[PDB]
Write a protein that binds this ligand. Structure first.
Ligand SMILES: CC(C)CCC[C@@H](C)[C@H]1CC[C@H]2[C@@H]3CC=C4C[C@@H](OC(=O)CCC(=O)O)CC[C@]4(C)[C@H]3CC[C@]12C
Ligand SMILES: CC(C)CCC[C@@H](C)[C@H]1CC[C@H]2[C@@H]3CC=C4C[C@@H](OC(=O)CCC(=O)O)CC[C@]4(C)[C@H]3CC[C@]12C
Ligand SMILES: CC(C)CCC[C@@H](C)[C@H]1CC[C@H]2[C@@H]3CC=C4C[C@@H](OC(=O)CCC(=O)O)CC[C@]4(C)[C@H]3CC[C@]12C
Ligand SMILES: CC(C)CCC[C@@H](C)[C@H]1CC[C@H]2[C@@H]3CC=C4C[C@@H](OC(=O)CCC(=O)O)CC[C@]4(C)[C@H]3CC[C@]12C
Ligand SMILES: CC(C)CCC[C@@H](C)[C@H]1CC[C@H]2[C@@H]3CC=C4C[C@@H](OC(=O)CCC(=O)O)CC[C@]4(C)[C@H]3CC[C@]12C
Ligand SMILES: CC(C)CCC[C@@H](C)[C@H]1CC[C@H]2[C@@H]3CC=C4C[C@@H](OC(=O)CCC(=O)O)CC[C@]4(C)[C@H]3CC[C@]12C
Ligand SMILES: CC(C)CCC[C@@H](C)[C@H]1CC[C@H]2[C@@H]3CC=C4C[C@@H](OC(=O)CCC(=O)O)CC[C@]4(C)[C@H]3CC[C@]12C
Ligand SMILES: CC(C)CCC[C@@H](C)[C@H]1CC[C@H]2[C@@H]3CC=C4C[C@@H](OC(=O)CCC(=O)O)CC[C@]4(C)[C@H]3CC[C@]12C
Ligand SMILES: CC(C)CCC[C@@H](C)[C@H]1CC[C@H]2[C@@H]3CC=C4C[C@@H](OC(=O)CCC(=O)O)CC[C@]4(C)[C@H]3CC[C@]12C
Lengths: 179, 179, 179, 179, 179, 179, 179, 179, 179
């Protein structure tokens, strides 16, 4: 992934006036989200489908049950969330050199943070179990499948949920501050 | 992929005078297309032929049915589209330092955007199913094949179609603005 | 891993006034931790699950016993520790350009160093043996499993424990210096 | 490996006053060690365990005999040696901007060079044979194993020993020069 | 099978006085039962467990589901029935050379014929299907298994049931004849 | 197969008065049917299911398509026909020692010969092809299967049909002779 | 097995004077033991070691656990018992043509019948389970193994125990008769 | 094969008056044909299709090329020839107990011997080579196949041709003797 | 094995005058040797080389170590011994119909019995262990191999040694009787 283009864009997008809460929120976003996703998370989800196995002899059942158990990977959801959260801060380049803008940005950023947090709760939950039960064609009746590295993905889920809750609390604090 | 050469060329190609609609179009192109293709999309289509399987014993039938089901990969079509869309904006370097030019650029950019959107509709459609039916030599009669990660590629297709429709609407808005 | 973003952040975060002990601690952190993790350690833990084998015919027992023997990889724990240790020094950017701060930073850095050292002692220990005994479902009764590169991971464990003990001694020396 | 961080640190660490012998030693270190390890040596030791085979049917005997024959890889020992040798020259950044220092640096650098040369002689020797005899559990009695690319690793061993002997001779020449 | 010992015993056991119905019953028994079992039936049930397959990867599930689907083979039940039916006629050798005996023999032969016919109805039924559903340990949940030569074993079942019904009708005819 | 019991029964069953046509029919039956089935035919149909293959990866499709292509083996049909044809001649033992009988025997033997000849025509035909097309569950759509020793089974079919036609012509000749 | 030599020897050994109980015992021995072992039992124990499987990857563990679970096959024990029981009746040929002898024969036959019945109880028991637990070298710790055709061997065990108990009761009846 | 039925039939068929040449012909037939086919030849052609291999990956090509190279096995042709040659001598049982007959028998026996000798020359030839070239569907273009035990089948072919030529010479000698 | 030819020869060879000890010896030979070898022993040694395995990857090492561990099978040694022991009793047919002969026969029979008993002690011993150690070419150094059915072959060895010792004691008793 070409993270240096996003780095240079975020360097040119952090020149806008911000409050204390906004700078604490940017510090949490830079440290607890970007460096961890861009350094640690890529290799964890590397052998997700290679080391996914099911107890059957039916061709094509592994693909069906893997696609049914993990519709979207965690890492790609987090990368999309990171890109979308910083979008309101990237519209400053277009709107500047070319206080209502600040309020609109804050409102949109709060709505995005809450939407992504709720979507993360509904998509995944709080844990990744080590077994899965599958009843999708072409598999015959119900079969059982086994997952790769479930403990380290439960740890990743819990850590990301905690960081997103912190950023949501700071967003609501600043929203109350504006009034 | 060497995306930093395109970055430096687009940095030297965005010095041309543009309208408000043109800057909104460039912002949508930079955010919703380049960062997602250059960060997220490369790894999704990595095991497309390795995890493609068919129910047969005939040598060479997997290659024939994979080539018949996916004549061109989605990711390479999107990269070519990204390069071609920014071509009219890259001819400014040749035509400058060396308002009719602006109008010609707008006309060509609208024609390219509509051509690629229609070609994307005719090549792929709106969904990627999880099964395929193949009747190509050397396969005997019709055989059935199974696809890798179909839900996340339906999600990618829908997202790209929405972004291309937004950029087409802005292109027609600016075309009407010029008159 | 994108270590150059952390490099540029640590270049912009080392402009704070520091004592002699703090500069010796930063030199030990830069040399004995970052260059070794960022150059040497990545390739050692590359085939940890591919070259992990157990003596059984049960599908899914390799995944269960590998997840039970190594809940979190050493390399990811060390990367997270490196990021967290430098966090108090990365809050200077937010708190500066925007002596109590120095004392609070020292207290938090000492607490983090001791917490990570104790957690490393409780998670892993001092050696990595070459055999493992597993009694987790779906494995039948107890089975025996064999580990990849155990001597070079015992060497890595001992080296990291020695460096962390040195940095803890310097942190307590500076804490006594402040009084 | 992130060799550009070490490059930038060595660029900022070569601003210290040095003698003629010290500059010849730095030239030999830069050319005959860093460029060869950082360009040529990484790919040679890539399939060391994949292309290591033994004549047996016992599960887990390949891991035991590979770990017994190569406790530490040559390439990682050389990288650690390169980092440690340049450490005395990297303490100048801390000790400068913040002739006894020069003498202490020379003494420590000579001790490190001799220690690593003797350790390299005792760990490996002068050649890498193409056969190995193993009598480690779980292997039954003694078994025979075959090695990958032994001639090119004997060539690498001899070349590195010659370069280290040259740098040791220059270190003792400068030590005599100081008196 | 040593059928010639039974042949010589039945040659020495058919010297007893019998009625017309008893000789018709012996003719049906000799032709429609002994020659067909002793010539045709042995090879049909030769690959019953070798060509029995189930859709699973679990060791030991084939043995469990084959033992659950066919507790006793058809051919061995028929051989035991043939031996037991001729037992009352083989007690004449002991009771002769050494009309109440004739009546007791007829009563016992009728009871045996009806018992075996009812047991054959309850054990097997009228058809052998080509699929089986198994939920026995160590198989996980329910699995599906496929049978070898089901049409020719349905034909064998129907033929044997018809012959046994004919012999039962003749036994009841003679029982009524005695009064 | 225990053919010597049938031999001894046919030796004790050929003591009945017969015409010239009946003795020619018995000679054709003894030579062209019993010796060939009892010597030559057993080994030809030994590997019928072992050397039967289909082009698929579906478990259980070989059993389904083999059972659909050969509901009853040729050799077992011929053995049953041989036993049934000689049945009217085996009722002489019961009816003798214990000319209307001769006429009834001739009528029943002609009816059996014609019934078996017509059934052989409808079951099999005149040739055994080397390919088969199968569309039975669990096979997906239509698959193609290959047969073992088809030329030698076409030769066997033609030879048996010719011999049965000769015996039918002699049976009708004797039936006309009686009037 | 050459059962016709034993047949001819038992034909020449049954010319001795015997009582009513002795003839009933010989009838039970001839029918319920010899014909069933010589016709039915040989094929049941044909694939005992081929269809015996264990859940392991260790070479040589199948042989060790099969030899530990079935030290002597049931069928060979029954054949030896049949030969030994008829031995006292086969010494009449030597002692005749060449009432104390009759009494000695009865005493020895009763002792043999009781010894074999008790040995059968202690060797096997009353049932054959479908699972076995093995802890014999070279198997690692305890492993689990699966048995072939356990229900039909429990049926065989029960039938043989019932017949042996009947023959023991008749032997003790005749022993009391002699006084 | 049940050769004892043919033995007993040939014992009852050699009671006809014969000349010296006819008895020499019967001696050659009994010794050089029946004992060798009935003792030696059965096991040679046992693994003809199991040990027949071709250099391809196409399913079903082995069956096609084996059926094309050996339309009828040598051993079955020889058994049929043996049965047919003795047929004229087996019609004596029907024609006797029930010199023109002798002449008709001699004429038919000579015609059969010459027909079978010429058919053996045209079907097979004089040698069995060790390679075969096959261009039959489903094989792609021409493929090469390898034969099992070719030298011992060339020896068998030559021996049988010599014996058949001797019997043909004796048949023509006796035909000339009759005139 | 054609044991009925030996049966008929031993029936025609037991017409010679013999003493009481000679008839007891013939009874022990007929019962405890011929019926057990001809009924029980053939199937025990059926899978001796198929179920013999060694822990290696070297082609041809199984054949070498099996031939080194079992130079001659037990069953073939016992069959040869049975044939040779009865040879002196088979020379009576030649020497009769065509008391010094009796003495010479007794002397030769005693010498043969003692020679075979001593040879059996030196060839095999008293037990068959379950492991074997092999150091024969092409095996590399020493390897370990595992044996099939060792307990039932130790039982067979002990039983045969006991019977041979009984027959040797009776032979020496009769030798002393002659004087
Ligand atoms: C996360 C995905 C699924 C939807 C992403 C939608 C974005 C494309 C949204 C989120 C932030 C939104 C922007 C937030 C702020 C505004 C400012 C608004 O203009 C101003 O505040 C300045 C001019 C004025 O004062 O009216 C125009 C719309 C815009 C750009 C919004 C348009 C819709 C945006 C770009
Ligand atoms: C997407 C693929 C399949 C075709 C790509 C074709 C391009 C090579 C096209 C699209 C944009 C086009 C250019 C758009 C604008 C013009 C300007 C035109 O010149 C001017 O407007 C300036 C001089 C003048 O005023 O006449 C000369 C042709 C050119 C470069 C066009 C030539 C053909 C181009 C390069
Ligand atoms: C390692 C993981 C599991 C927890 C990481 C928690 C961090 C997010 C902690 C460790 C360092 C802490 C900071 C260390 C120093 C302080 C300074 C404190 O403010 C000051 O010293 C300046 C203003 C003043 O003088 O009060 C406010 C809290 C803060 C940022 C702390 C908040 C909590 C932080 C960021
Ligand atoms: C290779 C591994 C196994 C051990 C690496 C140990 C290093 C951490 C050693 C080697 C070089 C040593 C340094 C070489 C020079 C000196 C200078 C000495 O101070 C001075 O010369 C300046 C002040 C003065 O003049 O006293 C303080 C110790 C120090 C940093 C040494 C401390 C121990 C160091 C850092
Ligand atoms: C099929 C299996 C499960 C049970 C087999 C039981 C047999 C052992 C049965 C069936 C036939 C029975 C026999 C049928 C006839 C009689 C005759 C009866 O004696 C007489 O009729 C003659 C003396 C008299 O007139 O009393 C003594 C019992 C006996 C042998 C019966 C005893 C029990 C037998 C042998
Ligand atoms: C081939 C299969 C499917 C059916 C086999 C049916 C047989 C059991 C048939 C064919 C020959 C038939 C027999 C042919 C001749 C007669 C003679 C008939 O009696 C007599 O001719 C003698 C007494 C008299 O003169 O009436 C009684 C029926 C019976 C035995 C027939 C009964 C039915 C039989 C046995
Ligand atoms: C089942 C296995 C383990 C041991 C088999 C031992 C046999 C060899 C036993 C069982 C029956 C026994 C025989 C039973 C009867 C007698 C009769 C006895 O002589 C007589 O009764 C007749 C002369 C006399 O009246 O003394 C001599 C011993 C002998 C043959 C016994 C010797 C030992 C025998 C042969
Ligand atoms: C080898 C296969 C392909 C054909 C086998 C045909 C047989 C069935 C042939 C060969 C010998 C032939 C027989 C040879 C001798 C004669 C004698 C002939 O009658 C006599 O010689 C006696 C009465 C008389 O003198 O006319 C009637 C035909 C018959 C049986 C022939 C009929 C046709 C037979 C049986
Ligand atoms: C077991 C194998 C390895 C050697 C087998 C050798 C046999 C072929 C031996 C054992 C018994 C021997 C026979 C035992 C008895 C004698 C009798 C002897 O003649 C007589 O006693 C009758 C005439 C006379 O009184 O001299 C001639 C040799 C011969 C047949 C012996 C010749 C050698 C024989 C056949």
């Amino acid at each position: 992934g070409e993270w240096t283009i996003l780095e240079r864009l975020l360097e040119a997008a952090v020149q806008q006036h911000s409050t204390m809460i906004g700078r604490i929120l940017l510090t949490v976003v830079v440290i607890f989200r970007i460096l961890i996703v861009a350094i640690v998370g890529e290799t964890v989800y590397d052998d997700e489908q290679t080391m996914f196995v099911c107890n059957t002899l039916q061709p094509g059942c592994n693909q069906a049950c893997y696609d049914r158990a993990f519709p979207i990977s965690h890492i790609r959801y987090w990368v999309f969330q990171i890109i979308m959260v910083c979008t309101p801060s990237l519209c400053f380049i277009t709107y500047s050199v070319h206080s209502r803008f600040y309020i609109i940005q804050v409102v949109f950023r709060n709505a995005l943070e809450i939407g992504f947090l709720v979507g993360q709760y509904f998509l995944y939950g709080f844990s990744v179990p080590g077994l899965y039960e599958c009843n999708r064609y072409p598999c015959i009746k119900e079969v059982e499948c086994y997952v790769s590295r479930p403990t380290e993905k439960t740890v990743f889920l819990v850590f990301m949920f905690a960081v997103s809750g912190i950023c949501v609390v700071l967003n609501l604090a600043e929203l109350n501050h504006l009034g």
